[PDB]
Design a protein around this ligand. Structure first.
Ligand SMILES: O=C(O)c1cc(F)cc2c1OCOC2
Lengths: 142, 140
């Protein structure tokens, strides 16, 4: 449960957003990238894995993820790929829409949407944000 | 304090590596940027704050930091403005540099290596363990 991420892509304004979701908490990492190439995907994963302890990624089995470039990055990071193995994503497009007019460029609106997402309290004033849940799940001591 | 980071640039192959160190843990976040512009800095600070609860960042004197874009980004994210971990990271990028085509790749490998690495004996901890433990403890 703590090491499992789901990667998905979304296409917005003719641009591609790569989204990684930490399945257990709802916490997200996201980046606008040039196009869905093996090198861009490898580089996103290497960055994700250097920040969070990533054991397994579930992917949509796109051509970017069957490349040897991505397989190699995953081997180097000790990440197991599960390609093709099983709509928050809609609310991210929503959030991006509600910050869009404070930033000139899509990439800035994406990072603002990431911030709002990971800070939002889910389940009422009684609840926890994704950012709070992920550290809770992942922490090894107290 | 759980909320305190320090940011530093190191120049290399005619680009800039922007480094933020979570002071209490030694955990590191880093990026290779074209130059130390206010726009790059502000974008970097916004990414950091969307991922970790940043309360305060300590920085050098530079013009990037008092830029209008950086003040807007700080104000929005709720961030208040104002080394051996760095010496270590520069050492690691050196030791991996040749394993990779682009600098940005060598830098991300060094960060992975740095944040995963256990310090001390059988009962020690990595920086990525310490940051998560400090924050989780603060929440409780
Ligand atoms: O909602 C929060 O305050 C929070 C707490 C964390 F420990 C870690 C993160 C948090 O949100 C920002 O993203 C990461």
């Amino acid at each position: 449960s703590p090491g499992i991420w789901q990667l998905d892509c979304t296409h917005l304004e003719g641009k591609v957003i790569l989204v990684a979701v930490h399945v257990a908490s709802g916490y997200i990492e996201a980046e606008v990238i040039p196009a869905e190439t093996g090198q861009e995907t490898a580089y996103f994963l290497l960055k994700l894995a250097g920040r969070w302890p990533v054991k397994t990624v579930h992917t949509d089995n796109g051509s970017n993820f069957t490349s040897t470039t991505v397989k190699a990055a995953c081997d180097w990071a000790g990440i197991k790929q599960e390609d093709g193995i099983p709509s928050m994503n809609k609310e991210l497009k929503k959030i991006i829409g509600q910050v869009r007019d404070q930033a000139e460029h899509l990439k800035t609106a994406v990072q603002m949407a990431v911030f709002i997402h990971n800070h939002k309290r889910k389940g009422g004033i009684g609840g926890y944000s994704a950012g709070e849940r992920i550290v809770d799940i992942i922490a090894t001591d107290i």
